């Protein structure tokens, strides 16, 4: 397939099927597609660029042309008929994984499939192009779903330095509390909206040395006793798991958390069911896209004639 390159470039500003921060900003700053002061060919080309950046970036153009279905399906508000231009892709396995929130990208879902982490009706499918029929149940290994929806596991060095800084700031807080305890308690209540033993209960912590703690993670595990992370380096409660182990949702997840209509998801088991092919209905389309109907109809007119 297409070799990923400059997918998230800010100058180009093309939105991609990804949960990435750069993709989030590209979606944020775009506003809307500009089809004005343009000939029909230029409008069609812009619509192709915008829509084809999102729906099937990996698909080769001459392959997408063959996959493209000129005949669409539709089951007071207006039916958005031509948002179904890319509904054919929604039955591909990788797209189903991405829409089920079992991956942070269509490319990541592709790697999950190709690396044998995906099953469809209990048979391991290793081909991203496998098309889902209605009623199929597909599952992903829970470790990979947790990695996809979790923060990056810090290296040992990075988390060790983060712990260094946390000890520094915790010592600072307890120092300032000891100096001026009464108003510290009162002003903490001020945000939350006297017992002098309060500051007495708080206890210092010893600054660690990177040179001496390097390369000894079991030792560093015992040496940390912060109130919030007791006896584990930051983000590495069990260092043998693929994710930030005190499991934390990945950054910038709310913008891209859409619950698809055509899939029924079980996050507890990392399973999903393909209810139906996405279908447009009055005032609503089940093809999750960031572009308006004019862009989709321009892309549809492009692909009907193949750019003529």
């Amino acid at each position: 397939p297409r070799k990923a390159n400059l997918l998230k470039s800010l100058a180009r500003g093309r939105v991609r099927t990804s949960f990435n921060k750069y993709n989030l900003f590209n979606l944020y700053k775009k506003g809307g597609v500009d089809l004005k002061s343009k000939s029909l060919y230029q409008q069609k080309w812009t619509a192709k660029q915008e829509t084809r950046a999102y729906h099937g970036e990996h698909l080769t153009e001459k392959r997408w042309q063959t996959v493209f279905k000129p005949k669409l399906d539709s089951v007071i508000k207006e039916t958005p008929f031509l948002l179904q231009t890319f509904a054919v892709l929604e039955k591909r396995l990788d797209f189903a994984l991405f829409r089920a929130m079992f991956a942070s990208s269509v490319r990541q879902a592709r790697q999950f499939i190709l690396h044998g982490n995906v099953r469809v009706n209990g048979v391991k499918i290793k081909h991203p192009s496998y098309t889902l029929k209605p009623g199929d149940m597909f599952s992903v290994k829970p470790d990979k779903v947790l990695e996809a929806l979790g923060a990056k596991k810090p290296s040992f060095q990075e988390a060790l330095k983060i712990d260094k800084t946390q000890i520094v700031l915790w010592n600072k807080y307890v120092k300032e509390a000891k100096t001026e305890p009464k108003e510290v308690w009162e002003k903490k209540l001020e945000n939350f909206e006297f017992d002098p033993k309060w500051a007495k209960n708080l206890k210092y912590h010893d600054p660690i040395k990177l040179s001496e703690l390097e390369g000894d993670e079991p030792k560093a595990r015992k040496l940390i006793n912060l109130p919030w992370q007791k006896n584990y380096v930051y983000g590495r409660q069990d260092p043998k798991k693929p994710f930030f182990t005190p499991w934390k949702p990945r950054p910038f997840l709310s913008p891209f958390a859409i619950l698809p209509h055509h899939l029924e998801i079980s996050f507890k088991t990392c399973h999903a069911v393909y209810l139906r092919d996405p279908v447009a209905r009055p005032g609503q389309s089940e093809v999750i896209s960031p572009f308006d109907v004019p862009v989709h109809e321009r892309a549809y007119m492009y692909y009907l004639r193949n750019g003529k």
Partner: protein
């Protein structure tokens, strides 16, 4: 007139001024930094409204138009914060009334440009259990339950299958604490839904590794037709998947 237009933000932002020659910066990177805010020593961006997921069953989607491009907020008080000529984030000059004036549906709209896109509701776990009990145990058909709960039949069947898998996993305790935490997190990010032919099996004597099965068929309808179109060297090459999941040419 089409022009190669560098995708600058539609909203106004604080652009570059006179720069140290070795800065080698671009306006787009500054827009990125202003959209995010300061970077924490942990690597986080706490000042942003979108760094942290919601927890009250109300999805938090990007609203750049209703925000006028200002996407920074106090992590605790949740009151808006905006850049200042001093260079330190501070309170806005005036209230942005449009952040208060959000339509009910627009709260559920993922993308500003596409109004038709909307996020489906998550069924409550009690409702899933109720559907599973009603169908599997009481015997109410999927039609009756769909009419009862305002759901579609295929969604009901998918719910039954998923609750079966969930039951098995709970029986073996295959669910882990990380999985429970992810389930509870995702559940709180979405709005909650409110209620014949002749066949012969041949004899299998000992030592035979497989069994012939003969299905009746009629001449003129059974066979591989002669002179059939060869599509292998064409773009419409037909491809299928054997039940083992192996790609085969069908």
């Amino acid at each position: 007139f089409s022009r190669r237009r560098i995708a600058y933000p539609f909203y106004p932002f604080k652009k570059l001024g006179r720069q140290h020659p070795k800065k080698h910066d671009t306006n787009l990177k500054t827009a990125m930094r202003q959209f995010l805010g300061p970077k924490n020593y942990k690597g986080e961006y706490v000042m942003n409204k979108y760094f942290t997921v919601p927890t009250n069953h109300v999805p938090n989607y990007i609203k750049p138009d209703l925000e006028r491009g200002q996407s920074l907020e106090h992590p605790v008080t949740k009151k808006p914060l905006q850049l200042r000529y001093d260079g330190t984030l501070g309170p806005p000059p005036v209230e942005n009334k449009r952040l208060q004036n959000i339509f009910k549906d627009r709260l559920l709209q993922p993308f500003p440009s596409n109004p038709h896109c909307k996020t489906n509701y998550v069924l409550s776990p009690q409702l899933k259990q109720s559907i599973f009990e009603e169908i599997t145990v009481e015997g109410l058909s999927a039609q009756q339950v769909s009419q009862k709960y305002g759901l579609k039949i295929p969604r009901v069947e998918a719910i039954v299958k998923l609750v079966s898998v969930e039951n098995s996993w709970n029986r073996r305790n295959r669910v882990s604490s990380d999985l429970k935490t992810m389930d509870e997190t995702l559940y709180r990010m979405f709005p909650v839904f409110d209620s014949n032919t002749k066949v012969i099996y041949g004899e299998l004597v000992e030592g035979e590794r497989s069994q012939y099965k003969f299905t009746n068929a009629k001449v003129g309808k059974v066979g591989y037709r002669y002179g059939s179109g060869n599509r292998d060297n064409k773009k419409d090459r037909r491809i299928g998947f054997n039940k083992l999941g192996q790609m085969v040419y069908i």
